[PDB]
Amino acid sequence: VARCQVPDCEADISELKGYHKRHRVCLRCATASFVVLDGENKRYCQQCGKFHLLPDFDEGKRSCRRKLERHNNRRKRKPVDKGGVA
Numbered sequence: 001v002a003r004c005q006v007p008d009c010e011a012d013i014s015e016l017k018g019y020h021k022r023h024r025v026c027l028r029c030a031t032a033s034f035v036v037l038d039g040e041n042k043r044y045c046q047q048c049g050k051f052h053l054l055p056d057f058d059e060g061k062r063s064c065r066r067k068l069e070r071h072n073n074r075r076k077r078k079p080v081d082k083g084g085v086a
């Protein structure tokens with residue numbers, strides 16, 4: 001539904017052409033960076049598109065800090081490769 005459903009900003013983006021219309025958010029919000037949501041400032045996460053919590057951010061880019069890394073130390077080592085015997 002092309003409509004900015006932001007508590008502090010109830011916009012009716014019925015005719016938009018960008019990455020804000022595909023997330024129920026107006027351009028003003030997409031550019032505003034942060035919005036005074038329900039007693040909480042949310043930040044448009046370009047990684048997921050949806051809104052996120054500002055206090056849950058870090059220096060590493062402007063996105064959530066969850067599931068940011070996983071495929072890095074993926075290796076299979078074997079210091080034994082024989083097992084016990086006695």
Ligand SMILES: [Zn+2]
Pocket residue numbers: 004006009010011025026027028029
């Ligand atoms: Zn808005």
Ligand SMILES: [Zn+2]
Pocket residue numbers: 045047048049052063064
């Ligand atoms: Zn995110």
